[PDB]
Scaffold this active site. Structure first.
Site, short mmCIF file in Angstrom:
data_model
loop_
_atom_site.label_atom_id
_atom_site.label_comp_id
_atom_site.label_asym_id
_atom_site.label_seq_id
_atom_site.Cartn_x
_atom_site.Cartn_y
_atom_site.Cartn_z
CG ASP A 15 35.47 40.46 42.85
OD1 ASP A 15 34.80 40.12 41.86
OD2 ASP A 15 34.96 40.97 43.88
CD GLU A 45 36.18 36.77 38.56
OE1 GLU A 45 35.80 37.95 38.77
OE2 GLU A 45 35.63 35.76 39.06
CG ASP A 158 37.86 30.51 41.58
OD1 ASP A 158 37.36 29.47 42.07
OD2 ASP A 158 37.22 31.58 41.46
MG LIG Z 1 34.06 38.24 40.64
#
Ligand SMILES: [Mg+2]
Length: 249
Positions: A15, A45, A158
């Site tokens: 994130d 990310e 992911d």
């Molecule tokens: Mg994110």
């Protein structure tokens, strides 16, 4: 023989696109990594900003970034004992989100290992692109397996999947979570009921993060990590839990 052979693979969308408490969170990520101490780590990310705590893991790992300097990208970290033969980054042609299949090929000891890390197209709307990418990834895995009998192949990251989206998985390739027992306690990797890093969702739970493998290791243990709130800033390291799979004979 392979008895007593064991390798752990951890995957985590960290994130990085969320700017709130980013430095504290990246420090927490590096902290958790040092405690779980996986042999192989997939990240998604990852961002340039406040990368230092992650980059400092280079004292323990070789670090390969998919596309450093881009808005966000992925990373594969391996033991310094991992002998790298190739690092290939395939850009998904149909992606509007700079998404890639990051492939690190090498060996640890005498065992050939292929590592494939991806972050598939995001959101419900991009099902078309995402399903095509997954199929493409599986074709690539099928080929690698055919070209390297006896190799260990790990594919995941992911994947942003809803289960009905999973297509042509080759026989011989298994989902780590499923093979470990499809445990409900370790099922959801993105859980907006329990994870409040992100607001505006209303109790959606998904198994977005997955690890598939093929090879001479037939048993797997599977846990979730990074589920504890950071005290100083009261957020989780990421809106995703990390997955942590240990493969053995
Ligand atoms: Mg994110």
């Amino acid at each position: 023989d392979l008895k007593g052979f064991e390798v752990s693979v951890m995957s985590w969308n960290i994130d990085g696109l969320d700017g709130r408490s980013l430095l504290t969170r990246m420090k927490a990520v590096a902290h958790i990594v040092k405690n779980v101490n996986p042999d192989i780590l997939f990240l998604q990310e990852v961002v340039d900003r406040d990368l230092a705590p992650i980059d400092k893991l280079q004292s323990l790992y070789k670090i390969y970034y998919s596309n450093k300097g881009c808005q966000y990208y992925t990373a594969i970290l391996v033991s310094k004992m991992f002998d790298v033969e190739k690092h290939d980054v395939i850009h998904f042609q149909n992606s509007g989100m700079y998404r890639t299949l990051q492939i690190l090929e090498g060996s640890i000891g005498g065992l050939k290992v292929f590592l494939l890390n991806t972050h598939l197209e995001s959101t419900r709307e991009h099902r078309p692109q995402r399903c095509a990418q997954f199929g493409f990834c599986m074709d690539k895995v099928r080929e690698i397996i055919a070209q390297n009998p006896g190799a260990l192949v790990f594919f995941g990251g992911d994947l942003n999947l809803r289960d009905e989206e999973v297509s042509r998985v080759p026989d011989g390739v298994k989902d780590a979570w499923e093979a470990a027992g499809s445990d409900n306690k370790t099922k959801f990797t993105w859980d907006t009921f329990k994870n409040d890093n992100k607001q505006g969702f209303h109790g959606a739970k998904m198994r977005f993060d997955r690890l598939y493998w093929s090879g001479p290791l037939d048993k797997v243990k599977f846990t979730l990590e990074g589920r504890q709130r950071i005290r100083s800033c009261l957020c989780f390291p990421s809106d995703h839990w990390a997955i942590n799979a240990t493969f053995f004979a």
